[PDB]
Chains A and B, each alone.
Chain A
Amino acid sequence: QFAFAAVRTAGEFIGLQMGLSFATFVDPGSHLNMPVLARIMDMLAMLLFLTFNGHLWLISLLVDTFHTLPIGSNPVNSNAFMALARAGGLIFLNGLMLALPVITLLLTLNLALGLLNRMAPQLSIFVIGFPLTLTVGIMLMAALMPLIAPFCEHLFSEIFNLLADIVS
């Protein structure tokens, strides 16, 4: 599940830089939040996982962990648990990269808007910045959609070989 968590994180951050849910910056956790991009890329990731037959692999590995770890009570290790907990870093680390391919340009766009506000005071931002940045984010990440699939396979491979290495 960690991989889908990472994809959801990247999608939610792209959406938040869209300005889609501005009420979280003023009222954190105020029952008003819609990470619709996060849901879009979450279901796209689920479709990709279905395509790459990840669930069959999961079932096969569930079977295989017997040979490594038999039903009979066997002694257990420690830092191994940390590994799964340390996998919590991946959700953030991989999420940053997916965003990076778009947030950076969005950042530049916001920087550009700043240059416009360095001119005649007020009369900018909250009136011209939001629609422009929304449309730019939309078309940018619409073009960025073909990019997730190699990253999707990368995420699945990372989770799978981490599982294989640490379960043992």
Chain B
Amino acid sequence: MTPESVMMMGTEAMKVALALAAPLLLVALITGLIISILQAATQINEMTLSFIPKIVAVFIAIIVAGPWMLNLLLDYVRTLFSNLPYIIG
């Protein structure tokens, strides 16, 4: 009820969002950086060949860590809906 509880609500929610999005974004960033440094080493420059492995890497990311995200988000939503009638004002 108190504004401290509200702002905590937003923080924990958006940290959950950060945890959900961090693996995919970080995998894409690492793949892009690796392809870019390889291009710099080989002196190859086409703006389209960096887009190819990124999709494959990010799609594999759901294969490997997808169940973890799905279990984390469901637990968050379940706990939020269960604690809903105790943060009422």
Question: Nearest CB to that of A128 among chain B residues?
Answer: B32
Given A48, A120, A138, A141, which contacts B40 in the complex, CB threshold below 8 Å?
A120
Interface string of B1-44 (1 = CB under 8 A from A): 11100110111001101100110011011001101100110000
Stretch at the interface among B45-53, B61-69, B75-83: B45-53
A contact residues, range? 20 to 34
Which residues from chain B contact A122 at a C-beta distance below 8 Å? 39, 45, 47
User: Given A121-B45, A135-B22, A44–B29 Cβ distance below 8 Å?
Assistant: no
CB atoms of A128 and B36 under 8 A apart: yes
Which residues from chain B contact A134 at a C-beta distance below 8 Å? 21, 25
CA–CA, A141 to B15, complex, Å?
10
B interface SS class: helix
CB atoms of A124 and B36 under 8 A apart: yes
Which residues from chain B contact A119 at a C-beta distance below 8 Å? 40
Which residues from chain B contact A142 at a C-beta distance below 8 Å? 11, 14-15, 17-18
Which residues from chain A contact B1 at a C-beta distance below 8 Å? 51
CA–CA, A52 to B7, complex, Å?
13
B7, B22, B33: which has the most chain A beta carbons within 10 Å? B7
A interface SS class: helix
Let me know if B89 is at the binding interface, CB within 8 A: yes
CA–CA, A146 to B12, complex, Å?
11
Question: Nearest CB to that of B21 among chain A residues?
Answer: A138
User: Given A51-B3, A51-B89, A131-B26, A138–B14 Cβ distance below 8 Å?
Assistant: yes
CA–CA, A139 to B11, complex, Å?
10
Question: Nearest CB to that of A47 among chain B residues?
Answer: B6
B6, B10, B40: which has the most chain A beta carbons within 10 Å? B10
Interface string of A122-149 (1 = CB under 8 A from B): 1110111001101100110110011011
Could you list which residues of chain B lie within 8 angstroms of chain A, going by C-beta atoms? Answer: 1-3, 6-7, 9-11, 14-15, 17-18, 21-22, 25-26, 28-29, 32-33, 35-36, 39-40, 45, 47, 50-51, 54, 89
Chain A to chain B: the 8 pairs with minimum beta-carbon distance, closest first = A131-B29, A127-B32, A120-B40, A123-B36, A131-B25, A127-B50, A142-B14, A128-B32
